[PDB]
Symmetry: D2
Subunit: 430 residues, 4 copies
């Protein structure tokens, strides 16, 4: 077993840090000046353009698909460094990556070639979105007996017709509310969009993913695709993840990602389990920024006393706790993404690892940021320090990407309850 970073991982770190310091630090000057969530997102466009030019969107797609992704550990390193500086634009990159994932993961070369093409060109500012989340919630979307998804799809001739509402998926409406360059819309199949989900069919058997591009939208009536609103978020105030209504929205059958059923659900589940492990790196970036800011402060400030405040056991205790949280978190993230790249391990072992990772790292990042503030004291509460921003940004992570309480803990619980559950398979082999 080894923890040593290769030259290309060190170089990926160097490159991510250089990009964040020279490009991302300037985003705040542009977006802070804007009035609402969409305008803040829009003032972020020149910085995503730079991200594209730095090869960062191409790095979200595997090499066999024409991208430059080196490995998931490389990716973990990048996100940490990005998020330790500025989640604006960084968020847009990872949300794009998530929106690409169902295409990346499907076993269909013609779809991949066609739909991933903008994202590997090194040009423009193409956006992708994985549109799963809804106004009514999604934690119980697979509950047998439940109403299931409320965005539904039905086949009419050689096309599918989308009826329903999405909320929260980042990037979904693109820069201009005319749509992301690629959207994967997760629907529950329903011949009659008025009828309740049959309580005798397993909901997983009814999942479809339909690909929607700016063209798919242009080919529909204006009112088939409506942006009803843009949430005003506590943190990550420069991301767009609007409220969208599909009314009789027409999609060619050839934009169906795969066969409806367990296979489509399986693509969603896999995309989101990967996000589950990677999200830890984002949480670590934010929590690390908080810890480093409080550490530097405690090593250089006496707070009107005779010694630097780090010399006070109660201050040191907080920073020790912060440090431990960060170190365990990063090890767990590298363990998780590594577990997910292991072809010899069954899916349930990977899924369990991914769930643990999202839960621990996101819960713990919050404590880390709050302990850092308590260490600094009153000064941390004002916006001449990073902490007010970090506080709001860190509370996103346990709630988003499938909240820990409703989704990730129940996904994990379900695995552990299975008769063939092997707790240590990812460590000691099966």
């Amino acid at each position: 077993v080894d923890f040593k970073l290769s030259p290309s991982q060190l170089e990926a770190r160097r490159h991510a840090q250089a990009f964040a310091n020279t490009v991302l630090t300037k985003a705040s000057a542009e977006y802070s000046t804007q009035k609402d969530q969409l305008s803040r997102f829009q003032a972020t466009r020149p910085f995503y353009r730079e991200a594209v030019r730095h090869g960062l969107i191409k790095a979200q797609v595997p090499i066999p698909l024409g991208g430059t992704m080196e490995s998931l550990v490389h990716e973990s390193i990048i996100l940490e460094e990005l998020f330790a500086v500025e989640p604006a634009t960084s968020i847009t990159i990872v949300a794009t990556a998530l929106g690409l994932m169902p295409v990346i993961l499907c076993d269909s070369p013609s779809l991949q070639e066609k739909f991933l093409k903008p994202f590997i060109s090194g040009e423009g500012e193409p956006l992708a979105s994985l549109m799963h989340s809804e106004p009514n919630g999604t934690a119980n979307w697979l509950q047998k007996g439940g109403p299931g998804l409320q965005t539904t799809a039905r086949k009419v001739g050689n096309e599918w017709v989308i009826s329903g509402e999405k909320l929260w998926p980042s990037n979904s409406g693109g820069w201009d509310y005319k749509g992301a360059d690629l959207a994967c819309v997760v629907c529950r199949v329903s011949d009659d969009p008025s009828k309740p989900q049959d309580p005798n069919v397993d909901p997983a058997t009814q999942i479809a993913v339909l690909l929607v591009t700016r063209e798919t939208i242009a080919n529909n009536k204006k009112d088939a695709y409506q942006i009803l609103g843009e949430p005003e978020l506590a943190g990550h105030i420069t991301t767009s993840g609007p409220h969208t209504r599909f009314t009789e929205f027409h999609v060619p059958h050839e934009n169906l990602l795969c066969t409806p059923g367990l296979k489509a659900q399986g693509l969603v589940e896999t995309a989101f389990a990967m996000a589950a492990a990677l999200v830890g790196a984002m949480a670590i970036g934010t929590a690390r920024a908080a810890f480093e800011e409080a550490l530097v402060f405690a090593k250089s400030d006496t707070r009107g006393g005779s010694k630097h405040i780090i010399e006070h056991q109660s201050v040191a205790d907080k920073l020790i706790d912060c440090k431990i949280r960060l170190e365990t978190s990063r090890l767990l993230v590298w363990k998780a993404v590594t577990t997910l790249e292991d072809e010899a391990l069954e899916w349930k072992v990977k899924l369990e690892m991914a769930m643990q990772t999202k839960i621990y790292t996101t819960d713990v990042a919050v404590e880390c940021v709050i302990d850092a503030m308590k260490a600094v004291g009153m000064k941390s509460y004002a916006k001449d320090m990073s902490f007010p921003r970090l506080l709001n940004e860190v509370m996103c992570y346990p709630l988003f990407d499938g909240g820990n309480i409703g989704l990730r803990r129940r996904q994990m619980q379900r695995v552990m309850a299975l008769e063939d559950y092997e707790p240590w398979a990812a460590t000691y082999g099966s």
Copy 2:
């Protein structure tokens, strides 16, 4: 022992809720359009005016002093109702109360009558402020052989001359930066400001409190009193607590609160100890608002499932923990204020109880808000719910009114280390 409330305690609650609901709810529409801390503060002036008209500033002064305060438990009840709805203005009220406290606690009847008049008249928008905190910090203000307060006073003829900077004291610059109506300025006596505090003199013996009014500031040259800035706060975004510089600022001897030294230190400690005990009520208000919004949601929303989310054990576990924190918190606050009113108890005993209360209630309120957010899920993160506001507001509490880590725990530790420490004196007697 008895927990029952009197008809007048119940009336204070009703009176406070009604004021909050009918008046304070309207403040957001006014302050939300202003684009800085001072402008947001100024936008709250009409609500503090209404607070005065409702007798709330008068209720901060005890009855023997011409005020209408019935007890500390009434006060706790009022603050909880107020902070449960809107800390805008509510914060101005308690900051005034703290500002008035050295005068209320001192025992010069004619000084009291003179300086408390505007606050018991039921007219205008009079502000008070206890100016203690400094740019360099104050956790070590009493550390022997340390720098001490960087705000310093010297006697010159019939007058005192203040040199130095304050930062954070709410209300200190008034509505218009010409000063609060009454500011109690905490100084370290020093004949030569350019020389360090004498390391062989106990810091507590050099403490003086000087009363500075709008007239005092008007009697000075323009560059003797200046606002250098106004912190942009994570939460409580409508309060004012600026960065003030005193340069050769002249104050009349008749404005000295009491003889410099231990009695002046004790006036400060007592004011901040009362505040330590009452601040729990503010924290309870904020956390209760979170808990109740979460509870209501959890009993009305299935999150696309077949039952209300309160029916899920993990969700209910969060609300349970929330409830418990709030209930233990309120009990401890009532215990604390009651202990402070008990004339048969030593200061040591009252102080320790006051410290415990500040520490517990303020730490636990944070957890209570965050757990409520986890229970509600993604929806808690958008500003059409109150949690973004509450998350920022609740984080003030462990940091302000003497941070838990640097000040409150150290004060409690010093009591516990005393040879004659009686841990249960407040319960079972001495």
Copy 3:
């Protein structure tokens, strides 16, 4: 609102202290030498005798019923002082109090007069036991569609017949395994013990409670009431709460405590909810003993340094946290018992408050003992300090008297889910 203690409350404290210091301190020298759980229990009989002589058993019974209980705050105060010194015998008193409660709470003066008699007497060593817990667990005893209690009673003639097993109930087999002087046996009504509980009927409507005495056991075959075993406990090593099998156990119909069904469930619920509130005083006692031993050590030992270890911010932080946990706990117990005594409040308001109390106090007392040990350091891990005993005894509280995970959180959760739940009714009332 007032936190002042009356002369009688301070006298109950002094009295309770005097007893624990002069009597209970001597108990360890006897039970320490004993081979097993039962031997250790029997070895505490002389001390329970002294508790009866000090009127402590009589103080578990209300005054209207010939006992000397002044209030639930008095009771809280007493239990805290007792458990601070020694949970041995102290546990027996309180397991007797719980055993008496369904009788204390019933609507029948004649049942009360007959059955409470030896406990208000001031003589002998009478034991009571509320026999509810079973080998297979009880957290789901009221779940519709589940197997329910596996101790069952049928009516045959002028008698009820008990079939089944009990486990854990303290005092249940008395000093000699011929039974507690009084046992309230909580049964599921089943005409055929071999048939599974009907999934169509609310389990709560099938609850019956049957009073079983040493006489009842004597009037039965010797193999109709058997003690299968005695659990060896982590802490509270001197209690007895054996594994008891009822096979065709005959009980007179006049020993039926009340009408089976929602009324008998009410009695069990009410009894355990009062236990929920008062158990906190026991947890406080144990954790207070940990805090105080750690406080004294921290204020007197430098651990080979230049200053007493309380001067180290990290050590003080631990003591602070202990203090806070204890202070918030007591406040919560007093609020809960007073809430239980307030005749103006709906039952569910009282129940929620008792549930909170049990949950907070028992969880937090474990934290309090462990932080106390961390503060003392390595020394705390050796049996010349109290901590090894306290650690073991403290871990009982979150698990016994209805564990927090399975039972008390679920009871609380049910209340909160009700359409007319009033979170603050016990503080502010109502409508």
Copy 4:
């Protein structure tokens, strides 16, 4: 970066498991019937014999030193497997390894060859102990201006004369109180023992380590080496770690490990930092036993309900939390041991990682056991389940091997406070 285990790592695991299952599981029958700590330790001797026979003591010693230790990860794997079954004898193995460490780490090939020979032999039951801890504590042994270690040494002629007391060092008295085969005794140099440590000289500059064999003790007056007692511990009840008194105890100069001073301190510090990382594996084993017992239970028991208790979210939550603590803990131990092995890293970087590991894994192991107990509920509290043992055993870890509060957080704090502190140097490399 790589997490995959090699064939020899997987074999090391299999071998440790086999030994734990077939040998160590039989240990309890023998020690349970003994009366006190020493007797329980002595009853353990034949299992330690079997451990030597299985190569496990030899595997505590690096290959270039004659041993068979393949790496610290191999070591970590072994310790977790052993401690997941039975810490009796297992603790004796690791206490010996600690005792061997200052010798293993010194730079003298002849001294190593001489003093390590018994331990690489494959025969007997040789014991080693690092005797550092003292009655008055050691958290402050390096505090300038403090009393310092109370066990002092001074040179008289061609020998050293030890005066004072040790407390806690496992194995220190050997099987029979005539001494461990090898004991490294840590002393503060002092010409007049009745005079206080000079407040002007750095305590670290005054540290010496003298090797004490059974022969050294044989060559002294009988009352020069006295065992004054044997602590009764809450857990790990089969270990011996006596109170020892040295009175004018003569040791040959050839038994001095190195010149007194910073180099001697450094060897003690490096020994205890290696232990600090590896103790995590011991904590993980104990807490893993607790988690697996609770998990198996949750998956096979409905607790009188209709579904296995793992289906209740609150139960699931506990098990999820235990699982996360264990996973994060093992990763951090492997990270930390691999950090200690990296020749390219500064010591401060290694030290900091080792302190983090000890603090986190040991605190978090206690939580894991407790949560597991809470999820099993009342059944976890009786000695027919593992938990009572597990609870007492797990509480040792935050306290021993340098307590978290007094020592490990202070060691970590000092490193963090240094001008040149690089937080991420073990991850991203130095600058």
